[PDB]
Design a protein around this ligand. Structure first.
Ligand SMILES: OC[C@H]1O[C@@H](O[C@H]2[C@H](O)[C@@H](O)[C@H](O)O[C@@H]2CO)[C@H](O)[C@@H](O)[C@@H]1O
Length: 430
């Protein structure tokens, strides 16, 4: 797709630091840019090509659409999509209300200049950030994470995209981003499945699939640490009944892991750990360092100056420890007694490879039309309840329903700041 001209793109300037030693870091003045989907698409006569949750007759196919339409810059980033930037701190507004419309959710990428993404090496390193999801409630998910995107964002691999990463094109992830309006640079118009309750979203024949390290999924009531691998951690387009995750007829029919190996302290049996007023009090800001090593991923907290470890899981059969090693991803599923997606795509070895795939970092907020975040913060799946890993959060099984959550908690906001990176031991001396 071509780049628009009715509205210049201006990336909000964000700082993060490259460390070598624990208190040996500095100033990298990168930037951020919201995803392609959140962006105006129209031709040269300025009729839309996307309206509501339907492509226009201003278009027609996967290909011609890419020629004749152009995506635009986002105007203001606060009045339109509630994106707030200041120094290191990056803030996101659940529900932005603006004179012309009402946006819910945003998903960004830390950058490297306005033309590329700040790519991260993962294997042998650890991330740090300070988050205050104090006002993030059930049904919401405030997300920080990596996904093996392409640097220039598909502009190169996919010439048709001549707007690329500069305009936050190229998102992929272990579901396969069926809902985006471009994949590989040729549209999803060809039979776009619209959502009955998401007037702006939809689904299209192709996905965009790749490595998805889910450092941060959460709210003020729970959190999960989720690495997911695929049989092609490298960015790739799938095909229709051969796309996975949640936008599809069969979740597990992808070349990737839709669920993966997840560590949620509440799901592993510790309902006293996380929350407002809990041990790891979620009524404010803390730091959450996460750790990537050969067959091991560690996550730890920093709050009120203190080292909070993450408690191990209670259940019989599970290893005596919180880390995400092959060990955990051998028993949790057989106890949680579910389809071991992880295993079938080729276990922790595959995850190893993926931990060498250079990926892009994202911060974001969104509601869950398909399962209203219950997977993250309630009892999921309902079907029964009372079973190991059934309960993930303290949040009622009522919550999530985007409309209700969107209407009642609209000042909802998450703040990402003080992102710190470098080899293990380098970002905090813990
Ligand atoms: O629901 C989408 C969500 O799935 C997450 O894995 C879930 C999964 O939804 C459910 O089928 C399984 O039984 O439980 C796991 C634990 O939540 C996945 O981790 C997310 O990436 C995804 O958005």
């Amino acid at each position: 797709q071509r780049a628009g001209n009715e509205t210049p793109e201006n990336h909000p300037p964000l700082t993060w630091q490259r460390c070598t030693a624990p208190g040996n870091c500095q100033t990298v003045n990168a930037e951020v840019v919201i995803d392609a989907n959140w962006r105006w698409l129209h031709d040269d006569n300025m009729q839309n090509c996307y309206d509501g949750n339907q492509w226009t007759n201003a278009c027609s196919t996967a290909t011609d659409c890419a020629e004749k339409c152009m995506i635009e810059g986002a105007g203001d980033y606060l009045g339109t999509y509630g994106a707030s930037t200041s120094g290191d701190a990056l803030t996101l507004k659940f529900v932005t209300k603006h004179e012309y419309g009402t946006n819910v959710g945003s998903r960004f990428y830390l950058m490297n200049g306005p033309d590329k993404y700040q790519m991260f090496n993962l294997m042998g390193n650890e991330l740090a950030f300070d988050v205050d999801l104090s006002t993030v409630e059930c049904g919401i998910n405030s997300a920080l994470y990596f996904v093996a995107m392409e640097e220039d964002g598909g502009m190169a691999s996919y010439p048709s995209n001549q707007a690329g990463a500069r305009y936050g094109t190229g998102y992929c992830d272990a579901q396969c981003a069926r809902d985006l309006k471009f994949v590989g640079g040729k549209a999803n118009i060809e039979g776009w499945k619209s959502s009955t309750s998401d007037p702006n979203a939809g689904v299209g024949p192709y996905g965009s699939c790749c490595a998805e390290i889910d450092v941060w999924e959460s709210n003020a009531y729970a959190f999960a640490f989720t690495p997911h691998a695929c049989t092609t951690n490298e960015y790739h387009v799938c095909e229709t009944t051969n796309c996975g995750g949640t936008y599809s007829e069969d979740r597990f029919a992808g070349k990737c892991d839709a669920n993966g190996c997840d560590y949620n302290p509440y799901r592993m049996g510790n309902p006293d750990f996380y929350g407002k007023g809990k041990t790891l009090d979620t009524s404010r800001k803390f730091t959450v360092v996460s750790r990537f090593e050969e067959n091991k991923l560690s996550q730890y907290f920093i709050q009120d100056g203190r080292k909070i470890e993450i408690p191990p899981p209670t259940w019989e059969g599970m290893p005596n420890s919180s880390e995400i090693t092959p060990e955990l991803c051998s028993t949790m599923f057989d106890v949680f007694n579910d389809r071991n997606r992880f295993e079938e795509v080729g276990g922790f070895e595959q995850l190893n490879n993926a931990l060498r795939v250079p990926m892009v970092l994202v911060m974001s907020i969104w509601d869950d039309h398909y399962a209203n975040m219950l997977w993250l913060d309630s009892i999921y799946p309902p079907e029964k309840e009372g079973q190991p890993g059934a309960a993930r959060g303290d949040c009622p099984t009522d919550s999530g329903v985007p409309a209700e959550v969107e209407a009642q908690f609209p000042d909802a906001q998450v703040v990402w700041s003080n992102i710190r990176f470098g080899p293990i031991g380098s970002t905090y001396d813990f």
